[PDB]
Scaffold this motif. Structure first.
Motif, short mmCIF file in Angstrom:
data_model
loop_
_atom_site.label_atom_id
_atom_site.label_comp_id
_atom_site.label_asym_id
_atom_site.label_seq_id
_atom_site.Cartn_x
_atom_site.Cartn_y
_atom_site.Cartn_z
N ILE A 162 18.73 -26.06 -18.27
CA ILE A 162 18.84 -25.65 -16.97
C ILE A 162 17.87 -24.56 -16.62
CG2 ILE A 162 20.72 -24.44 -15.72
CD1 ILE A 162 21.47 -26.04 -19.12
N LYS A 163 17.11 -25.07 -15.67
CA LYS A 163 16.11 -24.00 -15.16
C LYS A 163 16.78 -23.03 -14.25
CE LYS A 163 13.75 -24.06 -11.75
NZ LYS A 163 13.79 -23.40 -10.43
N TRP A 164 16.82 -21.80 -14.80
CA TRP A 164 17.43 -20.88 -13.79
C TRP A 164 16.33 -19.92 -13.06
CZ3 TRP A 164 15.70 -15.98 -15.06
CH2 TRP A 164 15.35 -15.87 -16.30
N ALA B 105 17.57 -24.95 -28.14
CA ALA B 105 17.39 -25.85 -27.26
C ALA B 105 16.08 -26.08 -26.45
CB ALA B 105 18.77 -25.79 -26.12
N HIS C 24 21.91 -15.63 -27.97
CA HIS C 24 22.83 -16.51 -26.91
C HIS C 24 22.19 -16.98 -25.80
CE1 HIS C 24 26.86 -14.83 -28.55
NE2 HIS C 24 26.06 -15.52 -29.32
N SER C 25 20.61 -17.16 -26.22
CA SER C 25 19.76 -17.56 -24.72
C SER C 25 19.14 -18.92 -25.20
CB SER C 25 18.65 -16.71 -24.90
OG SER C 25 17.73 -17.27 -23.81
N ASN D 171 24.16 -29.38 -22.53
CA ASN D 171 23.75 -29.66 -21.12
C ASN D 171 22.22 -30.10 -20.69
OD1 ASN D 171 26.37 -28.74 -20.57
ND2 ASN D 171 25.88 -26.84 -21.70
N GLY D 172 21.35 -29.90 -21.73
CA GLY D 172 19.90 -30.28 -21.11
C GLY D 172 19.42 -29.06 -20.70
N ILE E 290 23.09 -17.20 -22.03
CA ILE E 290 23.60 -18.04 -21.24
C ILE E 290 24.89 -18.97 -21.90
CG2 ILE E 290 23.29 -20.31 -20.00
CD1 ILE E 290 20.23 -17.46 -20.42
N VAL F 90 11.97 -19.44 -17.76
CA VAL F 90 12.37 -20.72 -18.70
C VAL F 90 11.18 -21.76 -18.37
CG1 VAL F 90 13.86 -22.49 -18.70
CG2 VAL F 90 14.58 -20.37 -18.30
N1 LIG Z 1 17.31 -23.53 -19.63
C1 LIG Z 1 18.46 -23.02 -20.29
N2 LIG Z 1 18.96 -21.72 -20.18
C2 LIG Z 1 19.84 -21.12 -20.93
N3 LIG Z 1 20.75 -22.21 -21.73
C3 LIG Z 1 20.58 -23.05 -21.96
C4 LIG Z 1 19.24 -23.61 -21.21
N4 LIG Z 1 19.39 -25.24 -21.59
C5 LIG Z 1 20.31 -25.22 -22.49
N5 LIG Z 1 21.09 -24.08 -22.65
C6 LIG Z 1 22.37 -23.73 -23.46
O1 LIG Z 1 22.02 -23.06 -24.62
C7 LIG Z 1 23.28 -23.32 -25.57
C8 LIG Z 1 22.92 -23.30 -26.83
O2 LIG Z 1 23.50 -22.18 -27.67
P1 LIG Z 1 22.47 -21.10 -28.09
O3 LIG Z 1 21.42 -21.88 -28.90
O4 LIG Z 1 22.07 -19.93 -27.14
O5 LIG Z 1 23.17 -20.53 -29.33
P2 LIG Z 1 22.29 -19.71 -30.38
O6 LIG Z 1 21.19 -18.98 -29.31
O7 LIG Z 1 21.64 -20.66 -31.37
O8 LIG Z 1 23.21 -18.53 -31.14
P3 LIG Z 1 22.43 -17.20 -31.62
O9 LIG Z 1 22.34 -16.53 -30.10
O10 LIG Z 1 23.32 -16.87 -32.51
O11 LIG Z 1 21.11 -17.88 -31.86
C9 LIG Z 1 23.70 -24.74 -24.95
O12 LIG Z 1 25.17 -24.48 -24.44
C10 LIG Z 1 22.62 -25.16 -23.75
O13 LIG Z 1 23.22 -26.06 -22.96
#
Ligand SMILES: Nc1ncnc2c1ncn2[C@@H]1O[C@H](COP(=O)(O)OP(=O)(O)OP(=O)(O)O)[C@@H](O)[C@H]1O
Ligand SMILES: Nc1ncnc2c1ncn2[C@@H]1O[C@H](COP(=O)(O)OP(=O)(O)O)[C@@H](O)[C@H]1O
Lengths: 511, 79, 79
Positions: A281-283, A324, A319-320, A278-279, A480, A287
């Motif tokens: 996303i600045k909440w 990315a 899950h943050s 998704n790119g 997120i 961030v």
């Molecule tokens: N600025 C942002 N804030 C939050 N989430 C975002 C942001 N930019 C992108 N993402 C999302 O983060 C997701 C990636 O998943 P994520 O990496 O959190 O799983 P993970 O953290 O690797 O799993 P784990 O928590 O087990 O490490 C994507 O869906 C992506 O779009």
């Protein structure tokens, strides 16, 4: 002196060829009437190492063309290994024996019989002597060196070694006189690449197919790192658009178009997508200040002469999307070299296979000037489990020395972990070794949540009014990626029941 | 099995620390003196290889916030 | 399974020590008067294979600080 590079064949590396010419090959081009007094015996063998695709095999033949042999016989190492013991070493013996006839026959005025090994590095592993671990192939090398420096020594020969792993070779194979001298090749600078582009274009410019709107000066530099080998394929691809241009029915750059297709040895742009859905996303402020901090200390490296290596890890709750963020930090400065290391592809491997993917990536990276490398989900590849402590000691051990391992002088890099839990790591003493850390708090609050949802735009003002009415007050603690997961789960609903499904699910998050 | 051992002390003293800055010259007299007012009569236990990363990480900053984050990140480590 | 054992003792006495030094002859009687007055009444647990490092490591200093360091080192092990 026949060593000038106005001859077209290769370019950009002028210093290194100059050097071999300087001390390696001066004896063979000089009037012999002098040296015949001095009796100075020539180098029998030489070594040159470097990255794979940098046009080393056209150096060797070019010196053969430069100082004429009858012809080269080129071989690949794996092209000779046999299950049957006799065969492999015998092949080598045939190669050398071709020359000895002329040498003994015609004495010491014979012309060179030249040899080339494409990669030695399998065969020339450094044997070591003890009852166990004698070796599998440790007996071919004996025959080899006995040809090189052996009895009835010959001056009729020249031999070129090649590798991408210069440190495994036995030290006696390369002791002076057998192969005395070593050279390094490194991925060419922009100057070398403008020369190379001049080369591969030199026919096209003469034939004037591509007359216009073509500048090598910019087109070289727009790529900071490539291999001269891929560029010729690039030029071939650049040749393909004019032929793919006449599918519709005198040449154009398609290079600016096609550079996106090419995987480099170096940076890749096409691996983000799986990592970036998704790119960014600045909440809120955390961030942007975080990735601002990334952009902050990246400059540290690029402007530092006393800290080639630096390191951070992004910690935070799960899950943050730390993965990315690291990827974006890589993508933000348009680095020369970026690469992912991840369990996705090293899946189902032993503790010593993934290690050899990792050392491969870094020693691949060491030889770039500036780089950014990223390792995701440390916990995963470390093979951590809470129930039992279980992990592979090997991996972190080999990893952290790399965190303390400086690359060769003048090259610098940063390294990025995404670990989601650091208590283990503090206990497991990786955290003193990393320079510093970043807490990435997941979203703690609804006033930020609906803001983010406005940025996404899934929900209407009423659907969002629902949230704004019911909970302003709770501090929700949520990663997120899960948010996206369940909005997409509630996005499928009867519209009336859409929203409160989301809410009810959302209140199951814990803590 | 080892015959003898030698303890390398880490750097406890602010003055000693300040001398290294004086030696390296990464920081000017004005800020170094500001530190001298700030940190003296003080015992600081931090690593040298840690220090390098600190002074440089601050040394890339604008000057106003430069030292402020320096000693903030330093005082991040109390002992 | 072992039919018998032997406890080897370790050097217990400045007496045994200084007569060993009479044997080696590295240190002459004059300084040893000092070391005599130092050891008497106290016990020593050190084995000689470590000693024979201490001897020369002290020896390589200048003669004046020689013996003071020697015994001052031995304080660690004797305690
Ligand atoms: N600025 C942002 N804030 C939050 N989430 C975002 C942001 N930019 C992108 N993402 C999302 O983060 C997701 C990636 O998943 P994520 O990496 O959190 O799983 P993970 O953290 O690797 O799993 P784990 O928590 O087990 O490490 C994507 O869906 C992506 O779009
Ligand atoms: N000046 C140059 N610099 C780098 N590469 C070059 C240059 N000139 C030609 N090349 C390309 O370098 C490539 C070297 O390929 P080769 O030697 O066969 O594989 P490897 O380089 O892995 O041994 C050749 O295919 C050649 O087209």
């Amino acid at each position: 002196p026949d060593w000038n590079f106005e001859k077209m064949g290769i370019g950009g590396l002028d210093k290194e060829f100059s050097d071999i010419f300087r001390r390696a090959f001066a004896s063979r081009v000089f009037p012999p009437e002098i040296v015949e007094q001095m009796g100075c015996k020539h180098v029998k063998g030489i070594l040159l190492y470097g990255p794979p695709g940098c046009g080393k095999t056209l150096l060797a033949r070019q010196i053969g063309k430069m100082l004429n042999a009858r012809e080269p016989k080129v071989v690949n190492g794996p092209e000779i290994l046999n299950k049957y013991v006799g065969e492999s070493e015998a092949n080598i013996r045939k190669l050398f024996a071709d020359a000895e006839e002329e040498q003994r026959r015609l004495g010491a005025n014979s012309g060179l019989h030249i040899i080339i090994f494409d990669e030695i590095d399998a065969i020339c592993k450094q044997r070591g002597s003890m009852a166990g671990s004698t070796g599998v192939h440790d007996t071919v090398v004996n025959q080899l060196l006995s040809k090189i420096d052996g009895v009835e020594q010959l001056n009729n020969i020249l031999v070129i070694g090649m590798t991408n792993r210069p440190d495994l070779i036995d030290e006696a194979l390369l002791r002076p006189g057998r192969l005395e001298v070593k050279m390094e090749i490194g991925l060419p600078d922009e100057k070398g690449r403008l020369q190379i582009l001049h080369i591969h274009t030199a026919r096209m410019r003469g034939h004037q197919l591509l007359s216009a709107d073509v500048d090598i000066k910019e087109l070289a530099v727009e790529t900071k790192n490539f291999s001269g080998a891929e560029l010729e394929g690039l030029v071939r691809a650049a040749q393909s658009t004019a032929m793919n241009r006449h599918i519709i029915a005198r040449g154009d750059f398609l290079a600016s178009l096609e550079n996106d297709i090419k995987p480099a040895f170096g940076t890749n742009q096409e691996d983000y997508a799986s990592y970036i859905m998704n790119g960014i996303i600045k909440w809120g402020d955390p961030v942007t200040r975080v990735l601002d901090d990334g952009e902050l200390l990246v400059q540290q490296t690029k402007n530092s002469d006393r800290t080639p290596l630096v390191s951070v890890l992004l910690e935070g709750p799960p899950h943050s999307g730390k993965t990315a963020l690291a990827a974006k930090i890589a993508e933000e400065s348009n680095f020369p070299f970026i690469k992912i290391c991840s369990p996705d592809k090293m899946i189902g491997f032993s503790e010593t296979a993934k290690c050899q993917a990792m050392k491969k990536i870094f020693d691949d990276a060491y030889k770039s000037q500036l780089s950014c490398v990223v390792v995701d989900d440390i916990e995963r590849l470390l093979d951590y489990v809470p129930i039992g402590p279980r992990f592979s000691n090997l991996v972190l051990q080999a990893l952290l020395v790399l965190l303390k391992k400086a690359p060769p002088q003048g090259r610098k890099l940063l390294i990025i972990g995404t670990t989601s839990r650091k208590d283990v790591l503090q206990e497991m003493e990786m955290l003193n070794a990393f320079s510093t850390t970043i807490h990435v708090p997941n979203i703690a609050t609804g006033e930020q949540l609906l803001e983010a949802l406005e940025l996404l735009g899934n929900f209407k003002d009423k659907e969002r009014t629902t949230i704004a009415q019911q909970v302003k007050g709770k501090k929700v603690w949520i990663g997120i990626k899960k948010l996206l997961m369940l909005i997409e789960m509630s996005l499928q609903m009867d519209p009336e029941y859409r929203v409160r499904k989301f809410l009810a699910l959302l209140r199951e998050e814990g803590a």
